[PDB]
């Protein structure tokens, strides 16, 4: 939640890039530089009191105080019915990434079905690299 | 939740890049780098008090509470059916990276059913590196 | 949760990259570098009370305090049917990366159910690293 960044290339703090049919003669580069970084985040200081029922007295009667009830939960159910009477395929391929009829599924459950959580969650999730390179 | 980069080549803090035909003569670099991190992260100081019924005195009669009633999940489950009469199939790959009817799939559960978590909890996934490569 | 970083090719402080055809004559590179980092993470003071009843006084009379009921997880549960006939494959790969109806499946459950967990809890997954290089 500070430096949350999505480089398609590269990064620097200094950066020189001297390409392509250049000439570079007696330069003189001097850097004098002071980049502290102090981080002070995410620094509690929680009281907390949870109760369901405190302090009954003399006769009383509870009932059903704190009912979730009937809970019903589907995330990830899709159909793909195909019904074909003739196929053909050709497929003639060269230097390419396919990908044909996959499934690719990621699920990150951090604090479900729970009661009286403290403190701190996270949930961090990147994707695949996938590259194909022909000379 | 501080630096999560996403980076698609390099990194670095200072870089040089001297490519593709360049002349680079008597140059003089001269750093003079302070660069200093303090990190103070996650610093809590908690006092809870998490009862269901506290201090029932004289004759009252409690019931049902706390309740997460009926529950049901059905986190993955999807169908994919295939009637297929007749089927032909001709490929001819070169150098190439095919996924033809995979199933890749990541499922992580930090914190499931539970009462009274306290402290810190994480999760990071980071997916597959995959490469082709031809000369 | 501070340097989670997906880097494609390469990390460093300082890097210099020289290629493809350069001159690269009487440089004089003079660093002087101070690069201290100073962690303080996760620092807790936890002071926790966690009573399902507490001080029942006197011909009182509970019940059904607490009651996660009736439970029921399927969390990966998939169909793939398939009915055909008559098929007829032909697959000429040449250095390449092929998958034909694989299933990769990971599962990972930290803190499944249960009461009252103090502390800290993590889960870090990193995918394969496939390849397939020709000259």
Same sequence: chains 1, 2, 3.
Avoid: W
Avoid at 62 to 68: A, Q, R, V
Avoid at 111 to 135: A, K, L, N, P
């Amino acid at each position: 939640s500070i430096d949350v960044k999505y480089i398609g290339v590269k990064s620097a703090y200094v950066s020189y890039d001297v390409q392509k049919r250049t000439i570079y003669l007696n330069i003189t580069n001097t850097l004098n530089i002071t980049n502290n970084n102090y981080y002070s985040v995410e620094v509690e200081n929680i009281t907390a009191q949870v109760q369901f029922s405190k302090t009954v007295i003399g006769k009383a009667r509870l009932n059903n105080i704190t009912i979730i009830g009937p809970l019903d939960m589907k995330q990830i159910d899709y159909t793909v019915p195909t019904v074909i009477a003739e196929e053909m395929s050709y497929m003639y391929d060269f230097c390419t990434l396919i990908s044909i009829k996959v499934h690719n599924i990621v699920l990150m459950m951090q604090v479900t079905v729970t009661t009286t959580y403290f403190g701190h969650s996270e949930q961090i999730s990147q994707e695949r690299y996938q590259y194909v390179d022909c000379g």
